[PDB]
Amino acid sequence: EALGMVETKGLTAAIEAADAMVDSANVMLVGYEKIGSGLVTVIVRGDVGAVKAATDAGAAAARNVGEVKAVHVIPRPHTDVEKILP
Amino acid sequence: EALGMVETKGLTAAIEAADAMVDSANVMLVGYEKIGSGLVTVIVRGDVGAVKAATDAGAAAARNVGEVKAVHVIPRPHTDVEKILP
Amino acid sequence: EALGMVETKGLTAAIEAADAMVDSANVMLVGYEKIGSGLVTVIVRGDVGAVKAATDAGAAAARNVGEVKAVHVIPRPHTDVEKILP
Amino acid sequence: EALGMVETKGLTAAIEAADAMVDSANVMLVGYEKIGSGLVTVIVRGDVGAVKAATDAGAAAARNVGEVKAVHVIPRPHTDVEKILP
Amino acid sequence: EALGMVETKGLTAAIEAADAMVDSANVMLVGYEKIGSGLVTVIVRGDVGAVKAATDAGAAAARNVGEVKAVHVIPRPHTDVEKILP
Amino acid sequence: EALGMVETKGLTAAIEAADAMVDSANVMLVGYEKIGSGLVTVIVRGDVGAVKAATDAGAAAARNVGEVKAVHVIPRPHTDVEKILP
């Protein structure tokens, strides 16, 4: 099941993008990851359609609050990637 | 209950925002987070009114001391958001 | 009791603040906190008069060494803020 | 065996690179390394042909998400270097 | 018990400063501290005259190799400052 | 014995420096250090000639992959300096 990622500079922008991503026809919040330098990545999992819609809504929400750095969907992620997710 | 956040660049400004918010209204200080690049977010919970007054006061007190980067209120935060809060 | 904070760019200016502050007066050096972007916050506790004199003395001294980003005293922080302080 | 590294600005680009790499060939995902200013290095091991396939796949995928900082393959790292690798 | 500090951006410049300061009557190398962001402070202890000379020589040598951010001596450090040294 | 360091901005350029260094001369790779802001130091030990050959070769290989921030040799490091090396 697909993975939506929204990365911001700023935690308030990340919390808002998360809030905005989980209403959703089945996407749950996995968590966020800090890599230092003010950069926060929020990660959701769900079916590709709601995930695509959810990550778009996250980026638009976060953009109101802060700086959005990356927006991305991985529709069919490999098993091995799991081991690098929060 | 509602969620409030004030994100500052600087820890001194954040501690002032925190102290100003809890004296301004019936909110509870949930905690603060650091994400690097000098970014510190303080987070409060309470009803939507008290969180709105608390953030405005916390922003205003922080601005007297340091840089405020974001002020935001989530009036009805989704259950999944509990996951990623201090 | 009272809270004093001198925030500097770089560790050398923070060591200088700390030394000036604990020399100053009857106050306890708690330590310092890193928040990224080279910022270091020095934290002391003591009676309000000493913490006032000490943060004055710390800021003055740090300024001779490098950049002082913030200086603040909170005479009587709220109990919930105490929970989040270093 | 060979060593493959793709280095990106940000975690969202690094996760894309990582997914693309393990998906594209018979390589083992080691993990990733944070080094500050937002830079993340993804590291993979496998035979030289697959590592060349995977680092190519990884870097082209990541360019669509964010900035790629380095792309490199070491067919046969020295023993002393094996010692210091993730 | 005087304290010499040289703060560099970059570890090579710091190692070079350390090696140039200790060649010196009695000044001993205390250690170095990283605060993130590329910033390293080298700290020496010894008598005031030899520490002033050591830190001037260390800053000169470090500037040959990298960027020097602060240079400072505290002639008579308070005993509580030891708490925040590496 | 002599001391060689190459400091890169980027982990990928540092691994390349380390590999090129030990394939260049009779050096031991002591290890690498991270200090934030993308800066990685690779350190080698050996007689002065080899350490000079190695750092030149490590620098030259890293530059084909990323930025080199510093290249330095200490031919006769003070014994005090061994305490701060990895």
Numbering used by the authors:
A (entry chain D), B (entry chain B), C (entry chain F), D (entry chain C), E (entry chain A), F (entry chain E): 4 to 89
Show me the paper's own sentences about this structure:
The 1,2-propanediol-utilizing microcompartment is assembled from seven different types of shell proteins, one of which is PduA. It is one of the more abundant components of the shell and intriguingly can form nanotubule-like structures when expressed on its own in the cytoplasm of Escherichia coli.
Overexpression of K26D or V51D mutant PduAs resulted in no higher order structures being observed by TEM in the bacterial cytoplasm despite the proteins being produced in quantities suitable for crystallization and structure determination (see results below). The lysine 26 mutant is the most important to study structurally because Lys-26 is conserved in all shell proteins and contributes significantly to the interface between 2-fold related hexamers in the native crystals. There is clear electron density for residues 4–89 in nine copies of the PduA subunit across the two crystal forms, and the C-terminal residues, including the additional 23 residues, are not seen in the electron density maps. In both crystal forms, the regularity of the tiling is lost in that the K26D PduA hexamer no longer has strict 6-fold symmetry, and the separation between hexamers is greater than in native PduA sheets (67.2 Å). In the first form, strips of hexamers are formed, and in the second, sheets with rather poor hexamer-hexamer interactions are seen. It is perhaps not surprising then that no structures are seen for the K26D mutant in the bacterial cytoplasm when PduA K26D is overexpressed. For one of these mutants (K26D), crystals were obtained, and these crystals reveal more fragile hexamer-hexamer tiling than in native PduA in one crystal form (type II) and only one-dimensional tiling in the other (type I). The mutation K26D has a profound influence on the conformation of the neighboring Arg-79, such that this region of the protein no longer adopts a single conformation in the crystal, resulting in breaking of the 6-fold symmetry axis of the hexamer. This results in the imperfect tiling of PduA molecules seen in the crystals and apparent lack of tiling at all in the bacterial cytoplasm.
